[PDB]
Design an enzyme around this catalytic site. Structure first.
Site, PDB file in Angstrom:
ATOM      1  N   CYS A 167     -44.431 -28.706   0.920  1.00 27.90           N
ATOM      2  CA  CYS A 167     -44.054 -29.306   2.205  1.00 27.90           C
ATOM      3  C   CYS A 167     -42.774 -30.162   2.081  1.00 27.90           C
ATOM      4  O   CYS A 167     -41.931 -30.288   2.979  1.00 27.90           O
ATOM      5  CB  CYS A 167     -45.194 -30.235   2.780  1.00 27.90           C
ATOM      6  SG  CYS A 167     -46.295 -29.734   4.191  1.00 27.90           S
ATOM      7  N   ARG A 210     -40.411 -29.589   5.828  1.00 28.54           N
ATOM      8  CA  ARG A 210     -40.356 -28.427   6.655  1.00 28.54           C
ATOM      9  C   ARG A 210     -41.622 -28.445   7.515  1.00 28.54           C
ATOM     10  O   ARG A 210     -41.601 -28.222   8.712  1.00 28.54           O
ATOM     11  CB  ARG A 210     -40.258 -27.207   5.711  1.00 28.54           C
ATOM     12  CG  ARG A 210     -40.912 -27.335   4.334  1.00 28.54           C
ATOM     13  CD  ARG A 210     -41.231 -26.056   3.560  1.00 28.54           C
ATOM     14  NE  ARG A 210     -42.662 -25.853   3.317  1.00 28.54           N
ATOM     15  CZ  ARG A 210     -43.628 -25.793   4.276  1.00 28.54           C
ATOM     16  NH1 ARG A 210     -43.363 -25.623   5.569  1.00 28.54           N
ATOM     17  NH2 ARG A 210     -44.924 -25.749   3.916  1.00 28.54           N
ATOM     18  N   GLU A 270     -51.110 -41.585  -6.099  1.00 32.20           N
ATOM     19  CA  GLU A 270     -50.529 -40.228  -5.945  1.00 32.20           C
ATOM     20  C   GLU A 270     -49.172 -40.019  -6.609  1.00 32.20           C
ATOM     21  O   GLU A 270     -48.928 -39.037  -7.319  1.00 32.20           O
ATOM     22  CB  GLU A 270     -50.424 -39.898  -4.423  1.00 32.20           C
ATOM     23  CG  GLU A 270     -49.679 -38.643  -3.924  1.00 32.20           C
ATOM     24  CD  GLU A 270     -50.209 -38.083  -2.590  1.00 32.20           C
ATOM     25  OE1 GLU A 270     -50.007 -38.734  -1.557  1.00 32.20           O
ATOM     26  OE2 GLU A 270     -50.868 -37.038  -2.577  1.00 32.20           O
ATOM     27  N   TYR A 289     -45.529 -31.332  -7.617  1.00 28.77           N
ATOM     28  CA  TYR A 289     -44.311 -32.099  -7.581  1.00 28.77           C
ATOM     29  C   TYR A 289     -43.948 -32.702  -8.932  1.00 28.77           C
ATOM     30  O   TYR A 289     -42.801 -32.613  -9.335  1.00 28.77           O
ATOM     31  CB  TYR A 289     -44.459 -33.163  -6.519  1.00 28.77           C
ATOM     32  CG  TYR A 289     -44.482 -32.635  -5.103  1.00 28.77           C
ATOM     33  CD1 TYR A 289     -43.311 -32.238  -4.475  1.00 28.77           C
ATOM     34  CD2 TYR A 289     -45.662 -32.641  -4.364  1.00 28.77           C
ATOM     35  CE1 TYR A 289     -43.300 -31.882  -3.148  1.00 28.77           C
ATOM     36  CE2 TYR A 289     -45.653 -32.275  -3.008  1.00 28.77           C
ATOM     37  CZ  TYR A 289     -44.456 -31.915  -2.411  1.00 28.77           C
ATOM     38  OH  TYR A 289     -44.418 -31.709  -1.060  1.00 28.77           O
ATOM     39  N   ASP A 306     -47.581 -32.832   9.600  1.00 26.51           N
ATOM     40  CA  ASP A 306     -48.589 -33.117  10.576  1.00 26.51           C
ATOM     41  C   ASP A 306     -48.668 -34.553  11.151  1.00 26.51           C
ATOM     42  O   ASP A 306     -49.224 -35.487  10.568  1.00 26.51           O
ATOM     43  CB  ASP A 306     -49.892 -32.614   9.888  1.00 26.51           C
ATOM     44  CG  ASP A 306     -51.210 -33.158  10.424  1.00 26.51           C
ATOM     45  OD1 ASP A 306     -51.321 -33.312  11.626  1.00 26.51           O
ATOM     46  OD2 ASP A 306     -52.147 -33.413   9.663  1.00 26.51           O
ATOM     47  N   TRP A 317     -55.960 -34.419  -4.156  1.00 24.87           N
ATOM     48  CA  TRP A 317     -55.566 -33.089  -4.612  1.00 24.87           C
ATOM     49  C   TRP A 317     -56.762 -32.377  -5.235  1.00 24.87           C
ATOM     50  O   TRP A 317     -56.496 -31.630  -6.187  1.00 24.87           O
ATOM     51  CB  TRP A 317     -54.430 -33.223  -5.656  1.00 24.87           C
ATOM     52  CG  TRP A 317     -53.134 -33.809  -5.110  1.00 24.87           C
ATOM     53  CD1 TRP A 317     -52.928 -35.173  -4.926  1.00 24.87           C
ATOM     54  CD2 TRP A 317     -52.115 -33.053  -4.622  1.00 24.87           C
ATOM     55  NE1 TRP A 317     -51.794 -35.288  -4.290  1.00 24.87           N
ATOM     56  CE2 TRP A 317     -51.286 -34.053  -4.071  1.00 24.87           C
ATOM     57  CE3 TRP A 317     -51.785 -31.690  -4.533  1.00 24.87           C
ATOM     58  CZ2 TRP A 317     -50.105 -33.676  -3.414  1.00 24.87           C
ATOM     59  CZ3 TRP A 317     -50.605 -31.309  -3.887  1.00 24.87           C
ATOM     60  CH2 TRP A 317     -49.782 -32.294  -3.326  1.00 24.87           C
TER      61      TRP A 317
HETATM   62  N1  LIG Z   1     -52.606 -30.646   8.665  1.00 16.37           N
HETATM   63  C1  LIG Z   1     -52.384 -31.002   7.399  1.00 16.37           C
HETATM   64  N2  LIG Z   1     -52.235 -32.301   7.070  1.00 16.37           N
HETATM   65  C2  LIG Z   1     -52.279 -32.731   5.755  1.00 16.37           C
HETATM   66  O1  LIG Z   1     -52.406 -34.094   5.505  1.00 16.37           O
HETATM   67  C3  LIG Z   1     -52.470 -31.746   4.727  1.00 16.37           C
HETATM   68  C4  LIG Z   1     -52.745 -30.392   5.140  1.00 16.37           C
HETATM   69  N3  LIG Z   1     -52.595 -30.084   6.425  1.00 16.37           N
HETATM   70  N4  LIG Z   1     -53.146 -29.435   4.242  1.00 16.37           N
HETATM   71  C5  LIG Z   1     -52.541 -29.641   2.897  1.00 16.37           C
HETATM   72  C6  LIG Z   1     -52.429 -31.102   2.570  1.00 16.37           C
HETATM   73  C7  LIG Z   1     -52.968 -31.690   1.333  1.00 16.37           C
HETATM   74  N5  LIG Z   1     -52.461 -33.079   1.063  1.00 16.37           N
HETATM   75  C8  LIG Z   1     -53.422 -33.949   1.486  1.00 16.37           C
HETATM   76  C9  LIG Z   1     -53.047 -34.847   2.515  1.00 16.37           C
HETATM   77  C10 LIG Z   1     -53.987 -35.780   2.966  1.00 16.37           C
HETATM   78  C11 LIG Z   1     -55.298 -35.879   2.418  1.00 16.37           C
HETATM   79  C12 LIG Z   1     -56.121 -37.093   2.685  1.00 16.37           C
HETATM   80  O2  LIG Z   1     -57.099 -37.380   1.947  1.00 16.37           O
HETATM   81  N6  LIG Z   1     -55.780 -37.973   3.674  1.00 16.37           N
HETATM   82  C13 LIG Z   1     -55.768 -37.676   5.164  1.00 16.37           C
HETATM   83  C14 LIG Z   1     -57.136 -38.337   5.804  1.00 16.37           C
HETATM   84  C15 LIG Z   1     -57.504 -38.876   7.300  1.00 16.37           C
HETATM   85  C16 LIG Z   1     -59.028 -38.759   7.741  1.00 16.37           C
HETATM   86  O3  LIG Z   1     -59.603 -37.684   7.495  1.00 16.37           O
HETATM   87  O4  LIG Z   1     -59.656 -39.685   8.339  1.00 16.37           O
HETATM   88  C17 LIG Z   1     -54.407 -38.210   5.757  1.00 16.37           C
HETATM   89  O5  LIG Z   1     -54.321 -39.125   6.602  1.00 16.37           O
HETATM   90  O6  LIG Z   1     -53.368 -37.696   5.342  1.00 16.37           O
HETATM   91  C18 LIG Z   1     -55.687 -34.919   1.416  1.00 16.37           C
HETATM   92  C19 LIG Z   1     -54.758 -33.974   0.954  1.00 16.37           C
HETATM   93  N7  LIG Z   1     -51.939 -31.908   3.512  1.00 16.37           N
HETATM   94  C1  LIG Z   2     -49.154 -31.410   0.654  1.00 13.90           C
HETATM   95  C2  LIG Z   2     -48.773 -31.633   2.059  1.00 13.90           C
HETATM   96  C3  LIG Z   2     -49.108 -30.768   3.131  1.00 13.90           C
HETATM   97  N1  LIG Z   2     -49.023 -31.128   4.449  1.00 13.90           N
HETATM   98  C4  LIG Z   2     -49.359 -30.033   5.450  1.00 13.90           C
HETATM   99  C5  LIG Z   2     -49.349 -30.064   6.985  1.00 13.90           C
HETATM  100  C6  LIG Z   2     -49.840 -28.673   7.415  1.00 13.90           C
HETATM  101  O1  LIG Z   2     -50.579 -28.572   8.655  1.00 13.90           O
HETATM  102  C7  LIG Z   2     -50.581 -28.121   6.166  1.00 13.90           C
HETATM  103  C8  LIG Z   2     -50.474 -26.673   5.985  1.00 13.90           C
HETATM  104  O2  LIG Z   2     -49.043 -26.432   6.229  1.00 13.90           O
HETATM  105  P1  LIG Z   2     -48.114 -25.175   5.783  1.00 13.90           P
HETATM  106  O3  LIG Z   2     -48.828 -23.968   6.385  1.00 13.90           O
HETATM  107  O4  LIG Z   2     -46.768 -25.416   6.419  1.00 13.90           O
HETATM  108  O5  LIG Z   2     -48.016 -25.219   4.294  1.00 13.90           O
HETATM  109  O6  LIG Z   2     -49.826 -28.700   5.050  1.00 13.90           O
HETATM  110  C9  LIG Z   2     -48.541 -32.415   4.844  1.00 13.90           C
HETATM  111  O7  LIG Z   2     -48.487 -32.846   6.010  1.00 13.90           O
HETATM  112  N2  LIG Z   2     -48.189 -33.272   3.770  1.00 13.90           N
HETATM  113  C10 LIG Z   2     -48.246 -32.960   2.378  1.00 13.90           C
HETATM  114  O8  LIG Z   2     -47.752 -33.690   1.512  1.00 13.90           O
END
Ligand SMILES: Nc1nc(=O)c2c([nH]1)NCC(CNc1ccc(C(=O)N[C@@H](CCC(=O)O)C(=O)O)cc1)=N2
Ligand SMILES: Cc1cn([C@@H]2C[C@H](O)[C@@H](COP(=O)(O)O)O2)c(=O)[nH]c1=O
Ligand SMILES: Nc1nc(=O)c2c([nH]1)NCC(CNc1ccc(C(=O)N[C@@H](CCC(=O)O)C(=O)O)cc1)=N2
Ligand SMILES: Cc1cn([C@@H]2C[C@H](O)[C@@H](COP(=O)(O)O)O2)c(=O)[nH]c1=O
Lengths: 316, 316
Positions: free
Chosen positions: B198, B218, B60, B146, B221, B82
């Site tokens: 984020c 900001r 990443e 980024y 999760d 992504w």
């Molecule tokens: N609630 C939230 N959390 C995020 O991790 C997230 C989001 N929203 N929406 C936008 C975003 C996109 N960035 C991301 C972050 C993590 C994965 C990912 O493949 N890994 C998760 C998988 C865990 C599972 O499903 O078992 C992780 O742990 O972050 C993909 C895109 N990040």
């Molecule tokens: C890309 C990115 C998003 N997120 C998140 C958590 C949120 O529940 C989700 C949507 O959030 P947002 O509405 O504040 O943009 O994006 C991460 O935790 N890590 C990351 O690097």
């Protein structure tokens, strides 16, 4: 009681910090990594252990919230905090051809032509800032200050986006929107600059009625520095909580290089021997409910009894 | 031992947070105001209580540090995190005229044409991202990610300023410079956006040899979210400390809306009953001393024994 994270944050810095040399070259005792909270229903986090003055925080502020940058005004509302940037301009001036103020701040301490005469080269610059508006316009105007970073961002296309105005209508259209920040760090402008913005970005929340704030101050001076930086951005929480008929929860304060400049070591020691002589109340007029036009006496801060006020040398 | 501020930060959120409804509409238990530290000589703050995977943080990252934005590459280094942003592009596509994936993420849970067939509408999008570079170029490229916020800021004048490159040469020319931040929040681009950044801004320090980091997230999760956000930006401290022959002190983590999304309440409870099964070691090759070209196996993380890995539903 309320200002105590600042009293607790200075105690940690002065035995327990690490000396770190700054540009001015009179170091520090610092930390890095600090986060601080205030809850504004237990009133105002305004500093009863020394005297902080409020008038001059309150004037500063509105100036920023009017999308302004002309020192002309700070002068009218009897303020002169942001002066010396427009002076650094007029003494290196194309058209202040004569009696120079070369190096004037790190040679205030040293005096003799800067002593009075620079401070009154300064006030005279100032009156033309107040009467020949040609000189307010073309001299009192610092340009990229917080009022043009918060309300006038210059975009990749010549014009302006008003950013504290979307804090105010998004707080209002979607409330518990995780994205509610204003940044004032503008990448492409930090190098040609004199002080890039200490108060980089601040994040909003709308808790559940409670409007809650958190400021990201990368640089921070405990002593002169941070007392005015608790109280401009908590007054923002009050103003904004009131602007969308929400009610103040709490202001939080993230720091960078949290610092107590080595130079004013013994006047901070001097404060932590005054015991936090209770807490003020900001009231702001029910009848005005904007935040953008506020003349001075609508926001009023009741019942202050500070300790006498403790004093610095030459800031730079 | 090392990951414990995340274990201590999730415990506080789930009885003691406040439920707050998000856009996805399955609320939270949150705080707001949180600051967290890690010291990277006691190794890597990589999560032994569940299994976090490192390969896919490491891939990443470099992607961002190469000034890149073409998912094409994430695919090559076997990554697909992504993906779905470029897919949201190709299914609303001008030229994917036919078998639509309308609403596909908040209808993964619901399946039946998204079930496999969207996940494999997706992988097929993906191969053209890998072979018809006309499709990497014009589809796998998210633009303002980024790597273009950290290395390609688009300025009020058409071109680019490279911002993580001045972290690297300023850390190096003036070390204990109080201004050493990169912001990725770009005001004038947050509204036309899908997720604004984020991980808004991160501040550097050069402590005394110790390179120290602090991230301003900001949104955040805790659970899927934050485990990868401790470990990309601590790996940055290692990489950068190494880039100017300085040595890792500590990574700090400022939060906004710190949150544990209500939906994955019982798998976080599940972790805080695994006891922090010691700590990994990142080593990075002595022989490569840049940070910008790093192929994958120079940064290597030694000795991990995680707990088995705990699993989520449909993120959105
Ligand atoms: N609630 C939230 N959390 C995020 O991790 C997230 C989001 N929203 N929406 C936008 C975003 C996109 N960035 C991301 C972050 C993590 C994965 C990912 O493949 N890994 C998760 C998988 C865990 C599972 O499903 O078992 C992780 O742990 O972050 C993909 C895109 N990040
Ligand atoms: C890309 C990115 C998003 N997120 C998140 C958590 C949120 O529940 C989700 C949507 O959030 P947002 O509405 O504040 O943009 O994006 C991460 O935790 N890590 C990351 O690097
Ligand atoms: N070390 C440091 N502290 C700052 O307050 C300061 C700085 N550096 N350089 C740039 C800058 C400019 N903003 C400011 C801040 C405060 C005043 C000011 O008039 N008030 C001081 C006075 C205390 C005294 O001298 O007795 C204060 O308390 O903040 C002026 C300009 N801020
Ligand atoms: C404008 C501003 C500057 N400062 C500071 C503290 C620093 O010692 C001084 C110079 O810092 P800098 O080198 O990080 O820009 O600026 C504040 O404390 N508050 C403010 O609002």
């Amino acid at each position: 009681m309320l200002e105590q994270p600042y009293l607790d944050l200075a105690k940690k810095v002065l035995d327990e910090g690490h000396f770190k040399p700054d540009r001015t070259h009179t170091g520090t005792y610092s930390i890095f990594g600090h986060q601080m909270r205030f809850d504004l229903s237990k009133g105002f986090p305004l500093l009863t252990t020394k005297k902080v003055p409020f008038g001059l925080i309150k004037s500063e502020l509105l100036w920023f919230l009017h999308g302004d940058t002309n020192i002309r005004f700070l002068l009218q509302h009897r303020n002169h905090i942001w002066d010396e940037w427009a002076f650094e301009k007029w003494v290196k001036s194309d058209e202040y051809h004569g009696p120079d103020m070369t190096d004037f701040g790190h040679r205030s301490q040293k005096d003799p032509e800067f002593a009075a005469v620079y401070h009154e080269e300064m006030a005279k610059f100032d009156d033309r800032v107040l009467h020949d508006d040609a000189f307010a316009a073309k001299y009192g105007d610092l340009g990229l200050v917080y009022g043009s970073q918060w309300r006038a961002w210059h975009t990749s296309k010549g014009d302006t986006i008003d950013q504290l105005g979307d804090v105010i209508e998004q707080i209002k259209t979607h409330p518990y929107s995780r994205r509610l920040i204003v940044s004032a760090w503008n990448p492409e402008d930090v190098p040609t600059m004199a002080l890039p913005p200490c108060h980089t970005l601040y994040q909003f929340y709308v808790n559940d009625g409670k409007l809650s704030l958190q400021l990201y101050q990368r640089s921070a001076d405990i002593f002169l520095g941070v007392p005015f930086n608790i109280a401009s951005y908590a007054l923002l929480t009050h103003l904004v909580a009131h602007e969308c008929g929400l009610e103040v929860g709490e202001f939080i304060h993230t720091f960078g290089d949290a610092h107590l400049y080595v130079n004013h070591l013994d006047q901070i020691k001097e404060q932590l021997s005054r015991t936090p002589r209770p807490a003020p109340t900001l009231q702001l007029n029910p009848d005005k409910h904007d935040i953008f036009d506020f003349d001075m006496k609508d926001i009023k801060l009741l019942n202050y009894d500070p300790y006498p006020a403790i004093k610095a040398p030459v800031a730079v």
